[PDB]
Design a protein around this motif. Structure first.
Motif, mmCIF file in Angstrom:
data_model
loop_
_atom_site.group_PDB
_atom_site.id
_atom_site.type_symbol
_atom_site.label_atom_id
_atom_site.label_comp_id
_atom_site.label_asym_id
_atom_site.label_seq_id
_atom_site.Cartn_x
_atom_site.Cartn_y
_atom_site.Cartn_z
ATOM 1 N N UNK B 220 46.178 21.183 32.148
ATOM 2 C CA UNK B 220 44.918 20.735 31.592
ATOM 3 C C UNK B 220 44.140 21.793 30.839
ATOM 4 N N UNK B 221 44.832 22.580 30.021
ATOM 5 C CA UNK B 221 44.172 23.515 29.121
ATOM 6 C C UNK B 221 44.154 23.013 27.681
ATOM 7 N N UNK B 222 45.097 22.153 27.291
ATOM 8 C CA UNK B 222 45.096 21.600 25.941
ATOM 9 C C UNK B 222 43.852 20.755 25.700
ATOM 10 N N UNK B 223 43.462 19.957 26.697
ATOM 11 C CA UNK B 223 42.299 19.090 26.537
ATOM 12 C C UNK B 223 41.034 19.899 26.278
ATOM 13 N N UNK B 259 30.964 11.012 22.995
ATOM 14 C CA UNK B 259 32.013 9.997 23.092
ATOM 15 C C UNK B 259 33.405 10.622 23.027
ATOM 16 N N UNK B 260 33.568 11.662 22.206
ATOM 17 C CA UNK B 260 34.875 12.298 22.072
ATOM 18 C C UNK B 260 35.309 12.980 23.366
ATOM 19 N N UNK B 261 34.367 13.297 24.255
ATOM 20 C CA UNK B 261 34.741 13.840 25.558
ATOM 21 C C UNK B 261 35.577 12.837 26.344
ATOM 22 N N UNK B 267 42.854 10.339 26.698
ATOM 23 C CA UNK B 267 44.086 10.632 25.974
ATOM 24 C C UNK B 267 44.977 11.594 26.749
ATOM 25 N N UNK B 268 44.390 12.622 27.361
ATOM 26 C CA UNK B 268 45.160 13.567 28.162
ATOM 27 C C UNK B 268 45.640 12.931 29.462
ATOM 28 N N UNK B 285 45.577 3.603 28.805
ATOM 29 C CA UNK B 285 45.828 3.474 27.376
ATOM 30 C C UNK B 285 44.877 2.458 26.764
ATOM 31 N N UNK B 286 44.761 1.282 27.392
ATOM 32 C CA UNK B 286 43.792 0.290 26.937
ATOM 33 C C UNK B 286 42.441 0.942 26.702
ATOM 34 N N UNK B 287 41.849 1.488 27.766
ATOM 35 C CA UNK B 287 40.552 2.130 27.641
ATOM 36 C C UNK B 287 40.565 3.231 26.595
ATOM 37 N N UNK B 288 41.633 4.036 26.550
ATOM 38 C CA UNK B 288 41.762 5.037 25.498
ATOM 39 C C UNK B 288 41.486 4.406 24.144
ATOM 40 N N UNK B 289 42.290 3.405 23.779
ATOM 41 C CA UNK B 289 42.089 2.736 22.501
ATOM 42 C C UNK B 289 40.663 2.226 22.410
ATOM 43 N N UNK B 290 40.194 1.558 23.469
ATOM 44 C CA UNK B 290 38.843 1.011 23.457
ATOM 45 C C UNK B 290 37.838 2.112 23.161
#
Lengths: 396, 396
Positions: B220-223, B259-261, B267-268, B285-290
């Motif tokens: 969890x360093x890429x995020x 929001x991008x947080x 996404x991660x 994934x659903x929520x990701x897209x949402x």
């Protein structure tokens, strides 16, 4: 007058492309080029283009120096009061030609486009070069090209017309720039009766006498091309004497240019006598050398006394110089004199190397490295000839 | 204020060298390259540099456009009125960096010198970059580098310093350059964790399953390394709200940047929970897209209505525009609007390909080809943002 930003940008772009193309060409030559292939015709053909590009660079430098030094050369040349060109224009034209030359030479090495015959790249390059000048439209410097095209017709006739400064200048810089005329004859023979036009091989790794019948002398197809600029200058000088009726300068110029006739004919005679191995080959040589000295020992004295007008009897603060000099540092004058003295004797080292170990095909490697030096000598001579002419015109 | 001719000459020289280097690099890539090694590490390492030169060139075009259009930006950027950096200097710097980048890439491709095996070249390139950036000598635009370093230090420590125009300007610019940070982190991970330094070149396929330690999200360093710019901008706007005491342009901006947080978090989470089995991933994934839907839609209503002041109720003759404009052509504005919509919603094609194709290494190559598009979107957006800021400053 400030130069346009687009002009300088084009100059820089062309210069950068030229440097990178030269570097990659050197790398391709050292690495990819194979040893067993003969590479004499390639340089023998591209030498003219290289010398022309070098001369355009040096002309740009010369005009830069003339404008900065304060010499009113636009009146000397009797040009239109537009100066017809900046030095950036000369640099840009020469860079365009250099980029084309490098592209053609690279194509002659890599053979990029499939199965296109390789004996067409120099033909296309020289066709583009000639077509850039004789373009009948009115684009790409439609004034200076016309001026040069009419001035190249005034010069290349000689006795009929009068004498002008531009004629004398352009005729002098055919003496130094004679290799361009020299290898056109080679190109003509090589394409006509030495290549494989029916086949596809422009390299020919064998040798013979008819294969090379034009890097020798044999007939007058070589010596006359050598002496054409001297002939033009001789006729121009004689016509000037006839029109003006002045004995001393023209009557000494006659001999100053006929010594070249004598040297060329004696050298060619030695070559033709040794082509079979006649005994008198060891006699005529004994003349060539001395007939060379009388050549050099002439022009050198003409260079310092009348060309640059140095060694003035009415001297001043400067040893062996004239009383009025425009250039700032005297080291330029002394270095120019010493380098002219060394460069005019660029035949002694040639004789020295052509008296020893017989490396195969060692003939033209000496000439390929000595031909570019004559253009530099002419470039040095231009500054002082023009400045002396400006001083003489201003004096009277 | 016309620039000196030497700067234009240097710009042209660097442009020509860069062009020829790019051409020969493409030729070597198609021809010379041998594929048994995954070349993807090279792309992932050099992408950040390439985006840097691209951004610098676009910034030069931007400042030229602002100077020509009449948008007085030196006053609003609190820069020195009597000392500015013209677009030519930016072009020259971009050309120099591109020349270094191309030289490093070519050296890595060819491996000329067989002592320094391969790994020295990228380290040397980025070392040259950082040494140039923080060079203490008073040379190479010593004012610009010092100003950039000071403002970078101010930006990176946001929650304490006061907020000016340039600080949040660079924050917005960095918001579109998370790829540089990701590439730097990937290079560090590659050099520290999985690279076996004691070797030559590394000509061993990475097709083995043991790879991917520095490719995934894992610990969890890429995020966080991707989400830093969002954090900086969010804290900056929070501090601006605290100083300004009112919420209309501040709290909604904070929510937009927050929001991008949730975006990157989900996404991660999807990626890290894919390997566990976890028959709920699609739910995430659903929520990701949402969540994406709000973010991709939150900026747009901000990019047009508030960033540029478009869609004004008092439009007049110019429909769908503002009341007063400086750029003459309306087609520019309309094309900018359409392209902004397309480039902000470009993620849909990427997700479609990565979810509907079965080609190895697909998502990353689509990311690579879409990478030099967010910087273009930023480049075009800057025009209208600066124009709107100028009009707002003129109003008050």
């Amino acid at each position: 007058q400030p130069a346009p930003a687009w002009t300088t940008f084009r100059v820089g772009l062309f210069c950068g492309i030229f440097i990178v193309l030269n570097i990659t060409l050197v790398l391709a030559a050292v690495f990819k080029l194979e040893t067993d292939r003969s590479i004499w015709p390639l340089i023998r053909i591209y030498r003219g283009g290289f010398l022309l590009i070098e001369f355009l660079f040096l002309l740009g430098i010369n005009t830069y120096g003339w404008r900065q030094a304060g010499v009113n050369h636009v009146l000397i040349f009797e040009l239109n009061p537009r100066s017809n060109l900046s030095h950036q224009h000369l640099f840009e034209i020469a860079g365009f030609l250099g980029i084309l030359w490098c592209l053609s030479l690279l194509a002659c090495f890599f053979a990029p486009i499939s199965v296109i015959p390789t004996y067409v790249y120099p033909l296309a390059l020289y066709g583009f070069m000639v077509f850039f000048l004789i373009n009948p439209t009115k684009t790409f410097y439609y004034k200076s090209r016309f001026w040069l095209l009419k001035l190249l017709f005034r010069v290349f006739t000689a006795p009929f017309h009068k004498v002008g400064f531009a004629d004398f200048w352009l005729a002098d810089q055919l003496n130094s720039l004679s290799v361009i005329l020299m290898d056109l004859e080679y190109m003509i023979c090589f394409y006509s009766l030495e290549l494989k036009w029916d086949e596809s091989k422009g390299l020919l790794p064998n040798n013979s006498e008819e294969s090379g019948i034009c890097h020798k002398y044999t007939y007058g197809v070589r010596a006359i091309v050598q002496c054409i600029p001297a002939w033009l200058r001789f006729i121009q000088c004689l016509r000037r004497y006839r029109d003006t009726k002045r004995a001393f300068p023209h009557l000494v110029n006659a001999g100053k240019y006929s010594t070249t006739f004598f040297m060329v004919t004696f050298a060619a005679l030695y070559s033709t006598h040794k082509e079979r191995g006649h005994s008198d080959t060891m006699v005529f040589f004994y003349l060539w050398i001395v007939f060379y000295i009388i050549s050099s020992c002439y022009t050198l004295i003409w260079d310092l006394k009348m060309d640059w007008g140095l060694f003035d009897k009415n001297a001043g603060e400067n040893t062996f110089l004239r009383e009025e000099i425009v250039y700032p540092q005297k080291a330029y004058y002394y270095c120019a004199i010493i380098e002219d003295v060394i460069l005019r004797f660029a035949w002694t080292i040639q004789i020295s190397i052509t008296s020893t170990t017989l490396l195969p095909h060692s003939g033209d490697i000496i000439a390929t490295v000595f031909a570019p030096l004559e253009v530099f000598r002419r470039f040095v001579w231009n500054f002082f000839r023009l400045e002396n002419e400006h001083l003489n015109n201003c004096g009277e």
